[PDB]
């Protein structure tokens, strides 16, 4: 009788990083938002939770 077994596994990870973008969360940021998005936000009838 003969029994012969092999197992093999590899894992590789590679990562590259390049520049990060940050946004300061100042109050004037609302003025930079797209107008159709802005009116969509402030037309939200928050009296309806489903909305």
């Amino acid at each position: 009788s003969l029994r012969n077994a092999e197992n093999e596994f590899t894992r590789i990870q590679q990562s590259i990083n390049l520049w990060s973008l940050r946004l300061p969360s100042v109050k004037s940021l609302r003025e930079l938002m797209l107008p159709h998005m802005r009116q969509q936000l402030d037309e939200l009838n928050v009296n309806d939770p489903k909305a």
Partner: protein
Amino acid sequence: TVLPGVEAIGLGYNPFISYASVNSGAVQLFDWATAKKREVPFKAGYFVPEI
């Protein structure tokens, strides 16, 4: 030219669906095609919104 990634920042986002990917999160909220642009100091010829 715009700096790559300036289209991805400000993207409306859902944190529960998945880890950091543009496929979690809906649509860009900000008009940064139109905002005042600054050149990025470490890459000549690339610009971002001043904010």
